[PDB]
Amino acid sequence: KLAYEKSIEMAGNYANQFDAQMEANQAIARTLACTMAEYGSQDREEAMSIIKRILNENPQLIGVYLGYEPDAFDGRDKNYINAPGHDSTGRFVPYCNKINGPVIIEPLVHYDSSDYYQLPKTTGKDTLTEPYFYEGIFMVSYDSPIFKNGEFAGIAGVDVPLEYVDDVASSIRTFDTGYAFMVSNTGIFLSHPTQKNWIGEKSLSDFDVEEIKNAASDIREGIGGHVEIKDPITGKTVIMFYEPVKTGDFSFVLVVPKEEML
Secondary structure (H helix, E strand, O other): OHHHHHHHHHHHHHHHHHHHHHHHHHHHHHHHHHHHHOOOOOOHHHHHHHHHHHHHOOOOOOEEEEEEOOOOOOOOHHHOOOOOOOOOOOOOOEEEEOOOOOOEEEEOOOOOOOHHHHHHHHHOOOEEOOOEEEOOEEEEEEEEEEEEOOEEEEEEEEEEEOHHHHHHHOOOOEOOOEEEEEEOOOOEEOOOOOOHHHOOOOEHHHOOOHHHHHHHHHHHOOOOEEEEEEOOOOOOEEEEEEEEEOOOOEEEEEEEEHHHHO
């Protein structure tokens, strides 16, 4: 019992450790959205300088961006058609990033259809995408709507690489062979100490094991809990303790061999 309780508190502790930097990254995008909502200077080069500075001052980010509805930044999309950092619409959609190494600004793509833009637009709320790969890099995006005159004008966002999650979670050891990993809200692995091919590829909901499917349903709802799983080949029971990460309802999971715990 004291054994279970210590493990529940450990899982909650690490879930909140991971949550702290996520709350900071969410606040960066949100604070940029507040600022842009009041930005009547309407100076595209200055706004590009601002997102470049925020990227440079935050090494945990790989991209910082703004994406606006037609004519919503400055009423002058026609004057920026195919300008540097722009596409053939002239919409202000600068994506300042270091994905390919050096810092560049290019237009966002898929803003008319992808969730990073469409979810804030339709919900009016700050959003966090499911983790994904983009040009070889595992990341998540945080996006906040920009409301001007009470109306949706666009989004401000940041891209956050998640390699650090694997670096940190895959070194956690508990008891003799206990270990830990993180998953997204839909149960996709963000880390695993041995199965690197599972990262961003497999979900808990993919396991043909009733208890792991039950955990994954709880994680999807942001609920903490634990399941006990008996391996019918070895006869051993492992307990998976999962505790929600408040930002996004991701989950931190500790996997502990029951016989070691007791």
